[PDB]
Amino acid sequence: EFNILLATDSYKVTHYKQYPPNTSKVYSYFECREKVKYEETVFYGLQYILNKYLKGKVVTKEKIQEAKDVYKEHFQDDVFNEKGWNYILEKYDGHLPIEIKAVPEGFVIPRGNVLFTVENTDPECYWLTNWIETILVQSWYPITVATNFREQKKILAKYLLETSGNLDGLEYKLHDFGYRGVSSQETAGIGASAHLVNFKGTDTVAGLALIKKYYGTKDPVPGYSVPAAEHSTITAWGKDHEKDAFEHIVTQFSSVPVSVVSDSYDIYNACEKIWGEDLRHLIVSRSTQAPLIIRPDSGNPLDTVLKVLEILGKKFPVTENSKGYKLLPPYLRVIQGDGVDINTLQEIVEGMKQKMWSIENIAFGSGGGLKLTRDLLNCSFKCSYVVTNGLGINVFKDPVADPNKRSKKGRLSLHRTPAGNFVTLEEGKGDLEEYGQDLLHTVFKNGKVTKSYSFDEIRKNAQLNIELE
Amino acid sequence: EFNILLATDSYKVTHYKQYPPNTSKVYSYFECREKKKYEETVFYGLQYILNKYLKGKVVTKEKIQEAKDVYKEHFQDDVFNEKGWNYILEKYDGHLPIEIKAVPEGFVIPRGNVLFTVENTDPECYWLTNWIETILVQSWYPITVATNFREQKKILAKYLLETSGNLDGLEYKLHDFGYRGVSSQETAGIGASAHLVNFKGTDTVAGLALIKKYYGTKDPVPGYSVPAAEHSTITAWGKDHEKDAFEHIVTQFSSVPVSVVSDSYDIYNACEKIWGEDLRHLIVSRSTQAPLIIRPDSGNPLDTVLKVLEILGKKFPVTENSKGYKLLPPYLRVIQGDGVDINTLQEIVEGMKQKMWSIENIAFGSGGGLKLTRDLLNCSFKCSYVVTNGLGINVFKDPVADPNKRSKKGRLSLHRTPAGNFVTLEEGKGDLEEYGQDLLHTVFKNGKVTKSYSFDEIRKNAQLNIELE
């Protein structure tokens, strides 16, 4: 079972002895510190952490003893604050005397703004604020995943709108195929849930269950998939029977969309001769609700997509839409799921546009051929205010060799500007009442989640301006 | 509770309808595919996955129903092999009819070799081999982390030996500080355990629990830490009292090693004036077993390390070791934990060597200021052999635009070559017995872990040649 006393950076075990004597308050905050890309971030994922790890009785006699014994061996010394943890156990029935304020989940906020704050609600637990830094800082991951997929969606939306005149199906243009490529089962759930803030197509089932348990959606599930082949279901037929494989698969899945990986041996032969000739009769008979989705999975992503489209464009009836772009028939689509990061996504849709192919023809997969870190958005947790001997003091770091690492001073609040933008006020200045109400909400207090958001409101908060029309 | 029926890529749910009819066997393998440097990989982490996710009764009626319900909504269609899963539940008491053979954990194997194979042990469960690809492929992470840290260890060892004449303390030269920068609690444990294959210093406690549970060590713990300050415990004293903070902390931890982050405001002033003058008397009095460890954490990693060393060398008595390199007194050391990836590590030690500073003077920390992916070592799982209508056929992919993605054919085995290197035999050629014993051993069969390795064995297997000498 998870033990919060063992879920911190080792050195933090020793910090209660390092703060100034008679420190009653330690107040800290999280931001995506400022540095033309990633100018605004989606705040998402804290609610998962609050619920899974921080809420309720998180301290017990057994957990304290377990922690004591581990740290004794780990430090080769007795440095563990048994008394402090016993105090939380005895006084608060193991509930953390901590208050956390945060911007609403799904909110899109410019870099360099306070996103959440953490402070102890009991003077005895001054050390607790930064003990939980490590666990809270991991919010960097869902924030960054949600932000990066939103930035990909912006690109897709721009080009889909330009080439088609609408945004129909945008939420299905970037399918998450990343399950095998993440570092653990837990990460798969978190990352997928972050993808699903932006999109609805996913092969990472773990995301659904996390969203259901921690957020909730009006719909039965937040994300969907369709039958698709992998290389093993094609190659198992034998090198000379790729056509037989294709035929079997599209016949098994004749009334639903089906994606068929087409590059096991020769993607271009597969498109021109197998799909485009030998099996063409099975493709042109398919319903608009059940297209064949051809999947290349190798070679230069851009060149391969453009060549596949040209091949298909000559074997199938192509129309020109109202915007002047070429459109495959509705029973035939392409998905490119190899090497698609934000850069190559941009490259492919621009390349298609230059060749007069509608973005309607294509979808993308995120997974193979790819990497986001805590430093991408400079996600950082810092102490900004302490009370020692009853005197509050504004604290910060400001390293001489890196002004970018300067942290904020004093008690923080988030506000609307007269123009309707966000501004973070420092040094308790929000109390001057010149900038209206603090936009942060208390979301955790003394062992209880005090405010939460459904996955539906998170998605609405995370919407693109272009979607808002 | 974890449900294996929900822990695969969604599309795999549909693959039982896509393999050739009358297929009784699907045999698949994992390799770190060669790429036309990371020439050798540490095989590590499968045992964790076998134990946590695959062994024992992993199928129940409730899990089948849970999956049935999820997939019905997720696919908006009833595709789901309920009968196939029922069969495993009824016939094998929910144990997976799968055999996995693997190279021993800790083994260091060149790229392009079979590391493990997977096959169904019952004809009815041909579909199961690749169902579990997703969960098994996540072994990419502990493999890549263990491999990357071993490669960093190689560099450290090379330079430590050159500048000092020995490898003393090598296992403590790269401390894991990466807890807050990974994507989840589970990843933290996995990644830390992989770091610990190579090193002993860690602030990620989760690594210890995982090792104890899944591998085991003679020693009580596989990894250690020491007291250390973070910016909050320094900055909380107020900008005018950094010296007071330093004094408090080193006095609190007078008899053990103590690391003190010294760049809150001005790392160079801190070293020269605070440590080097004001508090020098508290430093030169310390034991060799309890050094002060100065920690810069900002600026150019190389430039800052060299400048810190130059400062300290002028304030403290420096010796010249037998190799002609400068050495700080034993009560004083430096740790650089910002921006230290393999490339920067190399730059720093080479930079130090150029300025005649022994590597004895420095340690490094990983995590913060830096992102390994599945494609780094091209960790891949592919089907190479199937039996259809009683006939075995050797199968593979070989995409025309990317020969690097060609996969191996037929039944595989791993062998020592006459010169003592490694070779993977394809097409069942291992059966000819021309190459000695198959190095792959059955580690999993029909729900049981059949062979396990201790963490001590893994560490021994993963040793550097330089350590062997």
Author numbering:
A (entry chain B): 8 to 42, 52 to 386, 389 to 487
B (entry chain A): 8 to 43, 53 to 386, 389 to 487
Text taken from the publication that reported this structure:
The crystal structures of NAMPT S165F/Y revealed a somewhat surprising conformational change in a small helical structural motif spans the sequence G383GGLLQ388. We designate this motif as “380GRS” to reflect its position in the primary sequence, and its glycine rich characteristic. As the structural consequences of S165F and S165Y are essentially identical, we focus on the S165F structure in the following discussion. A helical structure of 380GRS is crucial for PRPP binding, as it is situated in the PRPP binding site and the electric dipole moment developed in the helix can complement the negative charges associated with the PRPP 5′-phosphate group. The unwinding of the 380GRS in S165 mutants rendered the structure less compatible with the binding of PRPP. Our structural studies thus reveal that the S165 mutation modulates NAMPT activity by interfering with PRPP binding in an allosteric manner. Consistent with the structural observations, S165F/Y mutant NAMPT proteins required approximately 500 fold more PRPP compared to the wild-type protein and the other NAMPT mutants. Structural analyses of S165 NAMPT mutant proteins establish the critical role of the 380GRS in NAMPT catalysis. Crystal structures revealed a previously underappreciated conformational flexibility in this secondary structure element that can be exploited by resistance mutations through an allosteric mechanism.
NAMPT functions as a homo-dimeric enzyme that catalyzes the rate limiting step in the primary salvage pathway for NAD synthesis, the transfer of a phosphoribosyl residue from 5-phosphoribosyl-1-pyrophosphate (PRPP) to nicotinamide (NAM) to produce nicotinamide mononucleotide (NMN). Furthermore, we determine the crystal structures of six NAMPT mutants in the apo form and in complex with various inhibitors and present a definitive model to explain the differential effects of the mutations on various structural classes of NAMPT inhibitors.
